[PDB]
Chain A
Amino acid sequence: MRGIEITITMQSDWHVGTGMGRGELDSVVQRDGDNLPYIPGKTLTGILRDSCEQVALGLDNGQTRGLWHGWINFIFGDQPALAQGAIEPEPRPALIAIGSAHLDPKLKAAFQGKKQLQEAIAFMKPGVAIDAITGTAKKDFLRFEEVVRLGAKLTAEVELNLPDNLSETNKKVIAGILASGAKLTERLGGKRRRGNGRCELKFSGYSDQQIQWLKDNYQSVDQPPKYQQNKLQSAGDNPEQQPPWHIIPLTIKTLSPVVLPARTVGNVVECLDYIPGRYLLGYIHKTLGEYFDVSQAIAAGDLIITNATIKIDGKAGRATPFCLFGEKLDGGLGKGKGVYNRFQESEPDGIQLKGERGGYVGQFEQEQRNLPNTGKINSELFTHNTIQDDVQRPTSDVGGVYSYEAIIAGQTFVAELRLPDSLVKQITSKNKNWQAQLKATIRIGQSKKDQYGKIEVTSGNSADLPKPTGNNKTLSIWFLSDILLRGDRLNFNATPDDLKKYLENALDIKLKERSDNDLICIALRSQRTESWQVRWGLPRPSLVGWQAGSCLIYDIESGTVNAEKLQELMITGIGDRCTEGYGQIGFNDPLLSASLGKLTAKPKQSNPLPTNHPTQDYARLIEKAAWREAIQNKALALASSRAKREEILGIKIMGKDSQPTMTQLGGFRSVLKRLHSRNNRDIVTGYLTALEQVSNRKEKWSNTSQGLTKIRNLVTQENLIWNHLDIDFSPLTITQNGVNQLKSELWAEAVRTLVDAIIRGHKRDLEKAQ
């Protein structure tokens, strides 16, 4: 069940901490991949759960354990971190999955490219401590804090995956509790207890009637039904595998951040920079298990799903060969120069090289004239905490802080689903449009119910089968993915002569290691992998092998290398566990074959809101704030020039004197503060005409540049203030007709800001001359 949405309206200024400051700011707010403020889904679930537990207290008569706490554990999942002792029941997952609440998509789009607006959404709030004795600001307790302007309307997807067997009665219970939590929730984020972050939270399609049903029925409920795993069901239908291999490219785009545990270590999880093929198998079930016995195919090895690597050159990127070495100072693929394929090239004279390790290289060919294109994955370390629910702060007993590396949004990946014709015949004969049905959005990774894990999947058209170049002199091997091999006693191990035996047997040839003193034969690194059987709630056995990008080369000692057998192994992969993406391999690739030392790398708007759009009122606040600061800056820029003060008002310095005397400016300045609104131009015009009538006061403004007329113009001509300031307001506006709406709005303040700036700036230059 999808398309339930939470809506949030912030009714006071609000703050979601990064848990740190930056520079002059002691607190700064979390911003999404579009640099706007947003509420992380992990916060949102945490707050909503907390209010639901308040309801559970009210229904369990304050018993901290009971039937209704049972329901909350049912709805929001158990907290096996905090329960302790010999708890026997498996920890249940939540039924409810909640995204991050983002700003409205149109408002978000409007800010694109408009950096100064993206800043103006926040503003600084001060804070201070007072010494109880002296009753003054306690120095070195002065604090400046970023907060986000109120009135923001945010929304997040919710998904419920209620059990299909769930009683209709229990659905209204769950709707009752969830509705109640939204109603009872009042605040989120930082300094809740001091008035930041007051909000309304509502579910689409839940209303008081849902609470009314609970209030009428709640005494009749029971404990929630016990949880059940969704087991597999094999069937044995699969027609036995026959060539050709079809190859379906799947494109994956990270719509949200994704967490892909490389190695857990205490309270922090490091992330990969590719998507393991194992993550997609659930999606294979959810979209193809109606057409063939997916589970039988895996056990037979009739299916392979590769890893997803970053897309480069329109295709799957390839992990950088460890045969490449860069000049320790000046070179390597990171610097676009000085890269040596040590299978073919000597080290340069004197210069020490270092082997390449990270990153991905795109396409290469027998003479590219350029180093292959290099890909990179952007990643960020997100941070979270646990609240100890009674003292309502983190504590070391509750585990404090934890953090995840994530792949950020907008990164894009490619993987290949590889199927024998045997299954494709079955699938196609049942549905010719199946490749259209592969288009889906799914959740994968760690923490997948919350803000993490949203990815788009999209089939391309069928790719061509790879066509390795046969070469009866030499076999050369590139590990495109991690390679797992059993030792001769079925244990895992990593000994390269096992792989020597393996390949020569599989290709039905004999191999000899490259013996040359200055061309390296072998460049491998070990690999070890943490993993979990989610089917069984236990870790997987620690896989050990060679990591992707390891490479090695051999001379062929005897036999002939069949080009067709090479193709087969490149499609199927070698070693163990190939089905989930390991074992992927490339033979005689031109990149391992060519010499590259001479080469280098190659050289390397927005639209308005409709006036009727609901967030237009919120955008109006951002527009005014950004305009105000820009006006203040540009007025102060123009006040800085002694020619500009003469141009605009005719004030100038002549010898020791100012024209007019400072008192005459001060008099005018005192009147100008009555110019609150454009109709008040009466008052300023009234003053100037009363001034002009008194000859002695009129001539006080002689030796100005026409000053009395210049002031009259600036106060009267609606355009003239904007002509002087000369601000391109286009990057500072986003509302339809916002420019005219805001110019007519701010006119009175623009005048006050400009004249005040000029008079003040003029005074400084008078002091220099005086």
Chain B
Amino acid sequence: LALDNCTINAFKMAIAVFKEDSKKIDLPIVPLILGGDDLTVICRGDYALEFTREFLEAFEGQTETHDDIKVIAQKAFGVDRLSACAGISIIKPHFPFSVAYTLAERLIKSAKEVKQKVTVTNSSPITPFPCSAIDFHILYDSSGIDFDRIREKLRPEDNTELYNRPYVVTAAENLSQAQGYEWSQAHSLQTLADRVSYLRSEDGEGKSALPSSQSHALRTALYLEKNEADAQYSLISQRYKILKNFAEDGENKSLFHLENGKYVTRFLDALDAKDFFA
């Protein structure tokens, strides 16, 4: 019962994100499941990330407030909070919702991998640390319609992944003791929201701090060999200084960093999610 109450309350808090539609009769969201462990809603697509983030943040906070949770969560994990994962499918209005929800199940199943990547210190049995996570995808018409085909299309070089997912949503302080904290920070959702924010910034005549044409060249480069993509970044970042913020090597010369022996980057997501924050 307490979990249902937390779910409903956090929803009331999160729907505040639909700020631009707040002038008119009904907010562009429809709850379909709203209790137990589960939230399932349809909403306006470009809002969904910010809406879902605020839900997860509010949900974790809310869970700490209940004694009906505290004594169980504290013994189960050593923290006042529980946590939740989410999967977000973003689709055109005519896209069959059955297919879109099917993908959302696969996406959340990916996001739940934080259970494996982040663990209670000296836990025995090894047990997941409480940490909310997101996975999402935007189903552009050529991007396929099943998770494996989607991710496959984003692995152009066998050693390279153009995505970097799942995104950790819980704030660093609430993870700061956990084993894998440093991994959780690399995968922190904040890193992407920052970088998209940069692309939405403008220069004084009102034009975005990176032009669209340059962005297209960067996406093209990601499908090339690593050395070519690393070159292309250098060329363009020498002109548009903001890209210094986007480098991931820590050497300010690659959009990529090495990860589990693969090369991955969050940068592509900042291109494709460029519009999708409320």
Task: Tell me if B235 and A265 are in contact (CB < 8 A).
Answer: no
Cβ contacts under 8 Å, A402 to chain B: 94
Task: Tell me if B140 and A633 are in contact (CB < 8 A).
Answer: no
B7 to chain A, nearest CB (A): 23
Task: Tell me if B144 and A23 are in contact (CB < 8 A).
Answer: no
Question: Quick one: which of B95, B212, B224, B272 contacts A115, CB cutoff 8 A?
Answer: B224
In the complex, per-residue mask of B86-111: 1 if CB is within 8 Å of any chain A CB, else 0? 00000010111011000000000000
A155 to chain B, nearest CB (A): 24
Q: Does B115 count as interface, using CB distance less than 8 angstroms?
A: yes
Q: Report Cα–Cα, A381/B144, bound state, in Å.
A: 7
Q: Does A378 count as interface, using CB distance less than 8 angstroms?
A: yes
Task: Tell me if A334 and B148 are in contact (CB < 8 A).
Answer: yes
Task: Tell me if B224 and A330 are in contact (CB < 8 A).
Answer: no
Q: Does A664 count as interface, using CB distance less than 8 angstroms?
A: no
In the complex, per-residue mask of B24-35: 1 if CB is within 8 Å of any chain A CB, else 0? 000000000000
Excluding A268-B94, A383-B141, A636-B235, 16 further A-B contacts by CB distance (< 8 Å) are A20-B140, A23-B219, A23-B271, A31-B142, A116-B220, A268-B96, A270-B96, A270-B98, A329-B113, A329-B115, A379-B144, A379-B145, A381-B95, A403-B95, A633-B231, A637-B231
Cβ contacts under 8 Å, B125 to chain A: 350
In the complex, per-residue mask of A24-35: 1 if CB is within 8 Å of any chain B CB, else 0? 110010010000
Cβ contacts under 8 Å, A18 to chain B: 141-142
Task: Tell me if B142 and A265 are in contact (CB < 8 A).
Answer: no
* Minimal Cβ-Cβ distance residue in B for A140: B206
A24-B212, A24-B215 given; A633·B141 CB < 8 A: no
- Binding site of A, secondary structure by majority: helix, strand, loop or mixed? mixed
* Minimal Cβ-Cβ distance residue in A for B148: A376
Count how many chain A residues have C-beta atoms less than 8 Å from C-beta atoms of the other chain.
40
Cβ contacts under 8 Å, B224 to chain A: 115-116
Q: Report Cα–Cα, A723/B146, bound state, in Å.
A: 47
Q: Does B77 count as interface, using CB distance less than 8 angstroms?
A: no
Task: Tell me if B141 and A23 are in contact (CB < 8 A).
Answer: no
Q: Does B53 count as interface, using CB distance less than 8 angstroms?
A: no
Which residues of chain A (369-401) have a CB below 8 Å from chain B? 376, 378-381, 383, 400-401
Cβ contacts under 8 Å, A25 to chain B: 212, 216
Q: Does A640 count as interface, using CB distance less than 8 angstroms?
A: yes
Interface size bucket, B side?
35 or more
A335 to chain B, nearest CB (A): 11
Cβ contacts under 8 Å, B272 to chain A: 22-23
Q: Which 5 A-B pairs have the closest CB atoms?
A: A24-B212, A18-B141, A24-B215, A268-B96, A401-B94
Q: Report Cα–Cα, A400/B148, bound state, in Å.
A: 30
Cβ contacts under 8 Å, B215 to chain A: 23-24
Cβ contacts under 8 Å, B206 to chain A: 139
B237 to chain A, nearest CB (A): 10
A124-B216, A329-B115, A350-B125 given; A380·B145 CB < 8 A: yes
Q: Does B124 count as interface, using CB distance less than 8 angstroms?
A: no
A267-B94, A401-B94 given; A637·B274 CB < 8 A: no
Q: Does B184 count as interface, using CB distance less than 8 angstroms?
A: no
B174 to chain A, nearest CB (A): 22
Question: Quick one: which of A28, A379, A764 contacts B146, CB cutoff 8 A?
Answer: A379
Q: Does A200 count as interface, using CB distance less than 8 angstroms?
A: no
A398 to chain B, nearest CB (A): 14
Cβ contacts under 8 Å, B274 to chain A: 23-24
Cβ contacts under 8 Å, B266 to chain A: none
B91 to chain A, nearest CB (A): 10
Binding site for B on A (CB under 8 A): 18-20, 22-25, 28, 31, 115-116, 119, 124, 139, 144, 265, 267-268, 270, 329-330, 334, 350, 376, 378-381, 383, 400-403, 405, 633, 636-637, 640, 761, 764
Q: Does B116 count as interface, using CB distance less than 8 angstroms?
A: yes
Task: Tell me if B149 and A329 are in contact (CB < 8 A).
Answer: no
A265-B96, A637-B231 given; A24·B216 CB < 8 A: yes
Q: Does B213 count as interface, using CB distance less than 8 angstroms?
A: yes
Q: Report Cα–Cα, A633/B98, bound state, in Å.
A: 45
Task: Tell me if A403 and B113 are in contact (CB < 8 A).
Answer: no
Task: Tell me if A403 and B148 are in contact (CB < 8 A).
Answer: no
A115-B224, A403-B94 given; A637·B235 CB < 8 A: yes
Task: Tell me if A378 and B140 are in contact (CB < 8 A).
Answer: no
Q: Does B122 count as interface, using CB distance less than 8 angstroms?
A: no
Cβ contacts under 8 Å, A31 to chain B: 142
* Minimal Cβ-Cβ distance residue in A for B221: A633
Task: Tell me if A640 and B94 are in contact (CB < 8 A).
Answer: no
> Can you pick out 30 interface pairs between chain A and chain B where the beta carbons lie within 8 Å of each other?
A19-B92, A20-B140, A23-B215, A23-B219, A23-B271, A25-B212, A31-B142, A115-B224, A116-B224, A124-B212, A265-B98, A329-B113, A350-B125, A376-B148, A378-B144, A379-B144, A379-B145, A380-B144, A381-B99, A381-B145, A400-B94, A402-B94, A403-B94, A403-B96, A633-B232, A633-B235, A636-B235, A637-B234, A637-B235, A640-B234
Cβ contacts under 8 Å, B195 to chain A: none
* Minimal Cβ-Cβ distance residue in B for A604: B158
Question: Quick one: which of A24, A330, A376, A381 contacts B116, CB cutoff 8 A?
Answer: A330
* Minimal Cβ-Cβ distance residue in B for A265: B96
Task: Tell me if A640 and B223 are in contact (CB < 8 A).
Answer: no
Q: Report Cα–Cα, A21/B220, bound state, in Å.
A: 16
Task: Tell me if B99 and A20 are in contact (CB < 8 A).
Answer: no
Q: Does B81 count as interface, using CB distance less than 8 angstroms?
A: no
